[PDB]
Design a protein around this ligand. Structure first.
Ligand SMILES: Cc1cc2nc3c(=O)[nH]c(=O)nc-3n(C[C@H](O)[C@H](O)[C@H](O)COP(=O)(O)O)c2cc1C
Lengths: 319, 94, 823, 191
């Protein structure tokens, strides 16, 4: 994919010589963002395992189950399939290749377009972030978000419809679609939204306006949408030609969409993981609905990462 | 048609149009539809002392072309000389 | 990294001289440039293509025919970092290619122009100084599936103190028609004295010279280089010339040859060659033709520069970072110059490093301009020129500043300046011409005639001053009043005096204005003005600005002045759609078509206003029995639509036999205007009020009952309401209904069939005041949209028949009957 | 504030009697559930707070979801059991209550509404109950009797006006106010 990797993908040179790092845009590009985020997660897992002095399988045996949000499902599968250090390295390379192909074919299927700058600057001044194919809404119910989605979609054709992509929680959703459609959703929501700092203590609750954080996420592909549906077959061809697959799972790895454990799955692990990454939305509550007293967030972002979101979802559930 | 015949035809037709517009209805609904739909005009500047046709064009756009503009991702800017002289002259406040 | 992937070696030969150990290495300069040229030929064209440097500079260089593909477009766009949606493959949108793909198409032809033996220099020391693109007028952008062929011509080869400058223009052609021009400058650093091989072909931009004086014609005829082949009378000429300079020294021209075609626009509007320019000279220090046209002529599309530059975007959004490697751009663009990708070649060239492509920097900054200046619309950016004033290494941070600084023929001029953040030195300096968004120019009719309108523009702008002054002088000379006085002061009464020769001419002007009515009875507009009258007084309770005859010229003139200020500032796109409401049509035509001079325009609008004023009978108090109201269906009910108003209006007219018709179709189901007798207008007002009270849905009545039953009910309402109208003492004063708002101060039912009687004198007046020479059909076809037809002006039999269906005019009947000759 | 008191006194029980705006008498503008969802974890962080539910409880079937905590699953939240339930308007019709027999019968006649439309008391009566404005500016839920109706009209047309306009407004509506005070309100015109 030399056509896609202009500035290269030599992460070692970027780490050792920061002056040679590509720009933030290229780094956030999906063909680069996916494998590098996988590398970050695998490095975190390796650091934990080696600091505590256990092999990957030894650490895995301490885990009741694992799962992942968007591309993290690949890393969850890798740690589930990893027993020794050599097997862990094999699984890490397999996952890196898989996510590289996922990002490359997703970018090819849906090239990153630039929104008009009047809309970009209006969103930035409004605080909605830079327009992108993924828009995170918060503090609204599924019914309310669905109503606004119908309001936006009734004015658009099928190919530009907005779809629910990540049901992170009751009060946390991500909508995927054209950035123009997501900006229209944002403007409609703003028209129906509370003014910044409005005092509504002496106002009826049903007459109170909406307090929510609609912000574009820094993701440059419409992940978990029909727009990337055509990329699934291409990624399947890539993985079957490269002989990439996972096997020998030793802990449950619960599906993001239907919640089923991957150990019981009969179809190929990589086929199903690609299908979830590209087409099916993510039911995070259903995925994480199983028993857990302690949860380890290995993803990126730290405070802004998936861990704090899972804490909000499971607050007071003993996890 | 040679240019001279073409000029003769244009002069005759324009004279008749102006003469009978005196005593025929003004079809502003249809004219708004022409340059909003067929031409897909974005910058609708009305040159006048008050934003009369700016308001009427905005009303027509909201009534009939609200979904059309969204579908085509077309941003229509309606400007009035008496109000948006800065925007028409490209003279934003420094 | 070659075109054919086969490695190519660049041998440097050095004689070893052990006798002189101080300098024992002597580079063989013989054929060194030819060896380097063979190396660069193998790089750019491949090893298989034979090396041939016997290229004639005077002959255009023919490039290969290339078919544009979605894969190529996507690869190039991603290489340059362009994220415009116009270049991604959306089905059913005709994916376009970036203007920067022009260099990809024309790289072979453009770069083949520095190889000729007459142009000798060190390619390793070659630097790209500047690159620019110009879209041809009316040429669509490049799109997928386009078969494009490039023709390159060497415009100039000069020796400057910095080196040998080579100018190459590559014109791209689609289906044999030129689409765009790509101008590139390459500088061979060093010292060159071969002035025998230098030349400069300069196509001078068309210069419009106005000869409004016998001395202007005298100087033009005294020019020996100017020859007249067609003996005609002209007031403006357009000189299009192609100078050709040959240098014997740096400051001396061996030979200057200027050939050109001088053109005249006839009153027919056909452009013909009245003469030629043919200047020859030997040793010379300048071109007299260019000097004369520059001093005594203005170029077409003058660049009007804003007083204050408008900064676009910001230093955070416009920042960029050069790629770590230049291979992705080199492979897509075909520029395999080793200076950008090989450390050893850059070191030999004594460059700081593997400098990134100047053309890549151009493409990135042009993508920024595409986004921010042109709103991410690719067809709007028509020209983009840049100067490579600095060198950029991989991973450098660049800060770009864009300023909207001027306009040219309604195209925004965007000055772009890229500097290096680390060093703050400039790397790119360029300008872009970008079309404005697709524009329609709407002009408004009567309704707003406040005192002092347009006076701010009158005081601020010289051109508005000129418009108002010409109009005021014509009014004072031919009608005896000052429209500026009327607009500024709005007097209630104004006395015109007819004394003197000029006053008697003014009296004759007033006497000659006829008007027609139904007895066609024709009589003077001013019955009381005769040969014996000394003066005439205009009166108005609400000021003379509210009178039609003075409202129309004032509004027309303020609109004309506003448009003239806009045009003089250069904010009028070439592709416009101008329309006017009622009176606004005359202002729009005199504005964009220039069909009416200012004087004829004020005459026509004044005559129209007086014709409206006198078209209706009036009592001893001046009160007329007609009028106009503005009716809103949505106020009556949500289900009440335009068809429902049309049905209601037709039935009210047909039952009581009183004139009542829809005159203005303003907004669908939200704003209409009905004109007629005050009888029938109050009839409609109370009819709609009672209809809203009864909650009758005439649409359902028609859809679920015979028209006889719908007629029974509506006619019953009409009889009761018309009886009430007749009961109200005449003349009936309208009252604001829920949907009906009477138009205060309007006493004439214009735009209705009542004025069909008065059309005919106005037709003759228009024929007199519109010279056939003033009509430019190219400024009307597809741009003029009348109110009569509400479709673009077209010289088609369908359009003429549409006009005939409304007017039944004898002239249009003749044209339609004899269209066979016009076919 | 209550959580601050509880943290200041970790050993002393503090009953937090949460009541939504739907409760009788003086009431807040807040929904019964939304503040609880955000602050219940912070409340439960203190082991001395005893969280009691109120504002709209009169029977076992409608109170048990809050006691057990299954009320929260309808909001896609984990169970949020309450430590107790307080009863207000339910017990005014009791035998030992001193409320008049006619008042009790009118209370029984009032049908009430579910939680989805308790907030439309602010505009019109709702199962025989309307919101009026007190002397202090707080809202009070009261049965839609004729006196309470006139209270509502006076809040909407008289007491909302500024002081500088109140006197002239009262003078303009002098006769109507007296007539309806004598006919409909508990405090007749003395004159
Ligand atoms: C007649 C009446 C008087 C009340 N008085 C008070 C009071 O004085 N102080 C207080 O904090 N709450 C008071 N309340 C509110 C109740 O204590 C309780 O929080 C509320 O009525 C619960 O609403 P519910 O009846 O729908 O269950 C009163 C309620 C009613 C109906």
């Amino acid at each position: 994919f030399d056509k896609i990797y202009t500035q290269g993908l030599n992460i070692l040179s970027w780490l050792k010589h920061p002056e040679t790092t590509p720009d933030q845009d290229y780094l956030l590009s999906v063909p680069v963002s996916c494998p590098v985020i996988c590398v970050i997660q695998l490095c975190h897992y390796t650091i934990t395992c080696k600091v505590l002095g256990l092999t990957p399988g030894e650490f895995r045996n301490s885990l009741k189950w694992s799962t992942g949000h968007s591309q993290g499902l690949v890393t969850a599968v890798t740690i589930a399939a990893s027993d020794s250090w050599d097997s862990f390295l094999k699984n890490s390379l397999t996952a890196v290749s898989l996510l590289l192909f996922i990002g490359s074919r997703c970018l090819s299927t849906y090239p990153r377009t630039s929104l008009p700058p009047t809309m970009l600057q209006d969103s930035l001044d409004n605080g909605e972030g830079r327009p992108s194919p993924m828009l995170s809404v918060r503090d609204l119910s599924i019914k309310q978000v669905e109503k606004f989605i119908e309001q936006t979609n009734s004015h658009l054709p099928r190919e530009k419809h907005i779809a629910i992509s990540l049901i992170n929680g009751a009060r946390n959703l991500v909508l995927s679609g054209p950035p123009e459609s997501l900006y229209g959703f944002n403007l409609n929501l703003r028209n129906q939204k509370a003014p910044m700092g409005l005092d509504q203590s002496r106002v009826p609750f049903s007459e109170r306006k909406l307090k929510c954080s609609n912000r574009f996420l820094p993701i440059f592909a419409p992940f978990h949408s029909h727009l990337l549906a055509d990329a699934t077959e291409l990624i399947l061809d890539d993985v079957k030609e490269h002989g990439l697959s996972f096997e020998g799972l030793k802990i449950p790895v619960y599906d993001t969409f239907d919640g089923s454990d991957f150990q019981a799955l009969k179809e190929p692990i990589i086929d199903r993981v690609v299908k979830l990454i590209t087409e099916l939305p993510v039911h995070w509550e259903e995925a994480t609905n199983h028993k857990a007293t302690h949860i380890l967030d290995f993803g990126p972002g730290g405070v802004s990462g998936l861990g704090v979101l899972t804490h909000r979802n499971k607050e007071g559930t003993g996890a | 048609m040679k240019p001279e015949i073409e000029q003769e035809l244009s002069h005759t037709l324009l004279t008749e149009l102006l003469a009978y517009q005196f005593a025929s209805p003004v079809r502003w609904i249809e004219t708004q539809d022409v340059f909003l739909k067929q031409h897909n005009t974005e910058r609708i500047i009305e040159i006048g002392p008050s934003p009369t046709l700016a308001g009427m064009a905005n009303r027509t756009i909201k009534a009939k072309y609200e979904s059309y503009d969204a579908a085509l991702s077309l941003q229509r800017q309606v400007l009035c000389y008496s109000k948006d002289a800065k925007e028409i002259y490209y003279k934003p406040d420094p | 990294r070659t075109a054919d992937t086969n490695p190519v070696a660049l041998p440097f030969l050095y004689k070893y001289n052990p006798a002189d150990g101080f300098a024992p290495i002597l580079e063989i300069m013989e054929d060194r440039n030819e060896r380097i040229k063979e190396f660069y030929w193998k790089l750019w064209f491949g090893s298989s293509v034979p090396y041939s440097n016997d290229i004639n500079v005077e002959k255009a260089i023919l490039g290969d025919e290339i078919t544009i593909s979605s894969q190529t477009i996507s690869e190039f766009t991603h290489a340059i970092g362009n994220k415009c949606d116009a270049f991604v493959d959306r089905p059913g949108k005709a994916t376009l290619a970036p203007m920067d793909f022009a260099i990809v198409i024309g790289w072979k032809a453009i770069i083949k122009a520095i190889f000729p033996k007459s142009v000798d220099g060190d390619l390793l020391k070659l630097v790209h100084l500047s690159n620019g693109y110009k879209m041809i007028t009316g040429a669509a952008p490049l799109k997928k599936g386009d078969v494009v062929s490039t023709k390159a011509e060497i415009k100039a080869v000069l020796n400057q103190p910095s080196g040998k400058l080579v100018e190459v223009v590559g014109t791209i052609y689609r289906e044999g028609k030129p689409v765009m021009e790509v101008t590139s400058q390459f500088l061979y650093r060093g010292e060159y004295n071969d002035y025998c091989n230098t030349f400069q072909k300069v196509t001078e931009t068309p210069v419009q010279v106005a000869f409004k004086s016998a001395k202007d014609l005298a100087v033009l005829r005294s020019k020996e280089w100017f020859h007249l082949e067609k003996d005609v009378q002209f007031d403006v000429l357009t000189f299009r010339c192609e100078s050709t300079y040959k240098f014997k020294s740096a400051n001396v021209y061996s030979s200057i040859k200027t050939t050109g075609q001088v053109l005249l626009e006839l009153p027919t509007k056909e452009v013909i060659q009245v003469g030629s320019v043919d200047y020859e000279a030997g040793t010379s220090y300048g071109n007299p033709v260019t000097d004369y046209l520059s001093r005594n002529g203005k170029t077409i599309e003058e660049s009007v520069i804003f007083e204050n530059a408008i900064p676009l975007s910001s230093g955070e959004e416009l920042t960029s970072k050069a790629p770590g490697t230049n291979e992705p751009y080199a492979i897509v663009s075909g520029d395999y110059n080793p200076i950008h990708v090989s450390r050893v070649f850059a070191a030999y060239a004594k460059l700081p490093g593997t400098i990134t492509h100047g053309m890549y920097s151009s493409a990135s900054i042009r993508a920024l301009v595409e986004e921010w200046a042109a709103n991410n619309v690719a067809a709007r950016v028509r020209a983009f020129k840049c100067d490579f004033v600095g060198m950029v290494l991989p991973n450098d941070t660049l800060q770009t500043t864009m300023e909207h600084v001027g306009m040219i023929n309604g195209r925004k001029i965007i000055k772009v300046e890229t500097r290096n953040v680390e060093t703050e030195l400039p790397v790119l300096i360029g300008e872009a011409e970008i079309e404005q968004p697709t524009t329609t120019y709407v002009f408004t009719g009567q309704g707003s005639q406040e005192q002092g309108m347009g006076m701010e523009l009158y005081n601020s702008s010289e051109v508005a001053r000129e418009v108002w002054d010409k109009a005021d002088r014509h009014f004072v000379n031919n009608y005896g009043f000052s429209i500026l006085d009327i607009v500024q002061n709005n007097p209630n009464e104004l006395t015109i005096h007819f004394g003197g020769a000029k006053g008697r001419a003014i009296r004759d002007n007033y006497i000659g204005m006829m008007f027609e009515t139904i007895g066609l009875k024709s009589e003077k507009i001013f019955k009381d003005i005769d040969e014996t009258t000394t003066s005439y007084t205009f009166v108005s309770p609400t000021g003379l600005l509210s009178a039609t005859q003075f409202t129309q010229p004032a509004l027309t003139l303020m609109e004309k002045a506003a448009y003239e200020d806009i045009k003089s500032k250069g904010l009028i796109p070439s592709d416009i759609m101008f329309a006017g409401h009622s009176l606004g049509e005359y202002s729009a035509l005199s504005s964009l078509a220039n069909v009416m001079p200012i004087e004829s325009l004020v005459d026509v609008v004044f005559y129209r206003g007086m014709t409206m004023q006198v078209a209706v009978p009036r009592d001893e108090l001046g009160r007329s029995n007609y009028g106009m109201v503005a009716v809103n269906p949505s106020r009556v009910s949500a289900t009440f639509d335009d068809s429902a108003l049309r049905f209601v209006v037709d039935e009210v007219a047909n039952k009581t036999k009183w004139l009542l018709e829809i005159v203005n179709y303003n907004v669908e189901n939200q704003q209409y205007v009905a004109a007629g007798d005050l009888r029938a207008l109050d009839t409609l007002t109370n009819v709609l009020n009672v209809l809203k009270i009864n909650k009758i849905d005439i649409v359902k009545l028609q859809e679920q009952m015979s028209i006889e039953k719908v007629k029974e009910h509506l006619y019953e309402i009409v009889d009761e309401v018309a009886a009430k109208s007749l009961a109200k003492p005449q003349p009936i004063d309208l009252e604001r209904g829920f949907a009906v708002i009477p138009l205060k101060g309007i006493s004439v039912p214009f735009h209705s069939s009542y004025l069909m009687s008065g059309v005919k004198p106005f037709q003759r007046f228009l024929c007199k005041k519109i010279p056939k020479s003033s009509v430019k059909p190219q400024d009307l076809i597809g741009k003029y949209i009348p109110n009569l037809t509400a479709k673009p002006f077209e010289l088609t039999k369908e359009y003429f028949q549409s006009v005939y269906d409304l007017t039944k005019s004898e002239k249009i009947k003749s044209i339609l009957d004899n269209w066979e000759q016009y076919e | 504030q209550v959580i601050a008191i509880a943290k200041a006194h970790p050993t002393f029980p503090i009953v937090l009697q949460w009541t939504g705006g739907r409760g009788g008498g003086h009431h807040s503008f807040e929904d019964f559930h939304q503040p609880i969802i955000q602050m219940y974890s912070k409340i439960r962080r203190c082991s001395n707070i005893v969280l009691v539910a109120g504002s709209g409880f009169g029977s076992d079937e409608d109170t048990y979801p809050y006691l057990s905590g299954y009320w929260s699953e309808k909001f896609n939240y984990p169970p949020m059991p309450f430590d107790g339930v307080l009863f207000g308007s339910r017990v005014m019709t009791s035998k030992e209550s001193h409320t008049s027999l006619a008042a009790k019968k009118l209370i029984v006649e009032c049908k009430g509404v579910p939680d989805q439309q308790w907030e439309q008391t602010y505009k019109k009566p709702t199962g025989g109950i309307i919101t009026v404005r007190s002397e202090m500016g707080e809202p009070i839920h009261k049965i839609a009797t004729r006196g309470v109706m006139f209270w509502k009209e006076l809040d909407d047309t008289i007491f909302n006006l500024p002081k500088n306009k109140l006197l002239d407004a009262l003078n303009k509506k002098r006769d109507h106010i007296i007539k309806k005070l004598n006919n409909d309100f508990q405090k007749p015109w003395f004159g």
